[PDB]
Amino acid sequence: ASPISTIQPKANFDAQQFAGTWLLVAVGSAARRAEATTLHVAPQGTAMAVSTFRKLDGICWQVRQLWGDTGVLGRFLLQARGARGAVHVVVAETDYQSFAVLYLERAGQLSVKLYARSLPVSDSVLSGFEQRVQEAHLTEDQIFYFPKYGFCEAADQFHVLDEV
């Protein structure tokens, strides 16, 4: 039924190799200002503890979440408590060392995200991501590029949102 149910996850997805810092490069979504976004991923059993840091008007904001394991390796679930609804996530493609293509589903809508260990992203990966977006029935105009400058990865106690 759900569009993400048919998206194939990374074979034998290894959270240990996926751990660390990832930079958000772009998002393909029919939904809807992009802020420099960094993720800090840490394995927690079968789940992954994820802190997202976003730079807004010179201030770094952190959001702590727990990506729960939904059974199949590489498939995760983000809870909903006061915001909107459940978000399903699948790490579809990654080499762990340079890029990751993730798919997300919110309210039945499928989006695609590209993350990188460092900038710039290779031409092959950028083109590959574009190909995946097209295959997801989205247009190039629905691809939003995020900042390549102004990243942050540390927030003070007054700018931390714990959703766990």
Curated annotation (Swiss-Prot):
Question: Which GO CC terms are listed, alphabetically?
Answer: blood microparticle; extracellular exosome; extracellular region; membrane attack complex; plasma membrane
The intrachain disulfides are 60-152
User: Which stretches are transmembrane?
Assistant: none
Q: What is its main location?
A: secreted
UniProt-recorded Gene Ontology molecular function terms: retinol binding
Q: How does it assemble?
A: Heterotrimer of 3 chains: alpha (C8A), beta (C8B) and gamma (C8G); the alpha and gamma chains are disulfide bonded. Component of the membrane attack complex (MAC), composed of complement C5b, C6, C7, C8A, C8B, C8G and multiple copies of the pore-forming subunit C9.
Q: What's this protein's family per the entry?
A: Belongs to the calycin superfamily. Lipocalin family.
Q: What is this protein called?
A: Complement component C8 gamma chain
Which biological processes are named by the entry's GO terms? Answer: complement activation, alternative pathway; complement activation, classical pathway; killing of cells of another organism; positive regulation of immune response
Tell me which UniProt keywords the record has, alphabetically. Complement alternate pathway, Complement pathway, Cytolysis, Disulfide bond, Immunity, Innate immunity, Membrane, Membrane attack complex, Pyrrolidone carboxylic acid, Retinol-binding, Secreted, Signal, Target cell membrane, Target membrane
Q: Where in the cell is it found?
A: Secreted; Target cell membrane
Notes on activation and inhibition:
Membrane attack complex (MAC) assembly is inhibited by CD59, thereby protecting self-cells from damage during complement activation. MAC assembly is also inhibited by clusterin (CLU) chaperones that inhibit polymerization of C9.
Q: Which domain of life is it from?
A: Eukaryota
Function summary = Component of the membrane attack complex (MAC), a multiprotein complex activated by the complement cascade, which inserts into a target cell membrane and forms a pore, leading to target cell membrane rupture and cell lysis. The MAC is initiated by proteolytic cleavage of C5 into complement C5b in response to the classical, alternative, lectin and GZMK complement pathways. The complement pathways consist in a cascade of proteins that leads to phagocytosis and breakdown of pathogens and signaling that strengthens the adaptive immune system.
